[PDB]
Design a protein around this ligand. Sequence first.
Ligand SMILES: CCCCCN(C[C@@H](O)[C@H](Cc1ccccc1)NC(=O)[C@@H](NC(C)=O)C(C)C)S(=O)(=O)c1ccc2ncsc2c1
Lengths: 99, 99
Amino acid sequence: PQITLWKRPLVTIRIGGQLKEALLDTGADDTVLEEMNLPGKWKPKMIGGIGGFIKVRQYDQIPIEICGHKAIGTVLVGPTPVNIIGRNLLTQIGCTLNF
Amino acid sequence: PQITLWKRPLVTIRIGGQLKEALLDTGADDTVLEEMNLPGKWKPKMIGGIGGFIKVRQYDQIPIEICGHKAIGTVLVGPTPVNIIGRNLLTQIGCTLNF
Ligand SMILES: CCCCCN(C[C@@H](O)[C@H](Cc1ccccc1)NC(=O)[C@@H](NC(C)=O)C(C)C)S(=O)(=O)c1ccc2ncsc2c1
């Protein structure tokens, strides 16, 4: 698809068999989802943005289907204000900015 | 142009005829610039990010050029670690996400 930006670029994702809404975020290095259960071992990590740093759980090699496009990559889980799809997965789905 | 997302989508912007590097950020509602001493009236505002809120100064109707594309709108100024071009300006330059 081509997505304009008059509204937040929210899309439906499927992860660990569950549907969620997530923001396509070119300003995010990493993909960060709200607290949830994922299978496998996680590593404690910290990430930062505006407002400072939070503690997250890093899950590696996690399949996510984003708007019908498959990705398998690193997914951080923690107290993010919104589900964020970052550049690590946006590149996997062939997403670019155009103007 | 087309901008891939292998690295942060940083571009040159002009504000006050002065050049700066800024992130093209689809996850940002508003435009947030690092501390700078812009002339004119402003309003205090709080904006929320991954780790909490920061205090910003809201300036209205500020001309900005983004990659040689003219825009004019609201710019928030405050202690952000990176200059952020948000959707309020991205729409004005015809920027889309595409995959
Ligand atoms: C929480 C709501 C959704 C994300 C919003 N952020 C934009 C986001 O792209 C920032 C943009 C950003 C802010 C600060 C440093 C680096 C990028 N990225 C990050 O926080 C990421 N951090 C990094 C390092 O990529 C995380 C998600 C991994 S934001 O920067 O917090 C933001 C920007 C503009 C704006 N206007 C009104 S509220 C508001 C909030």
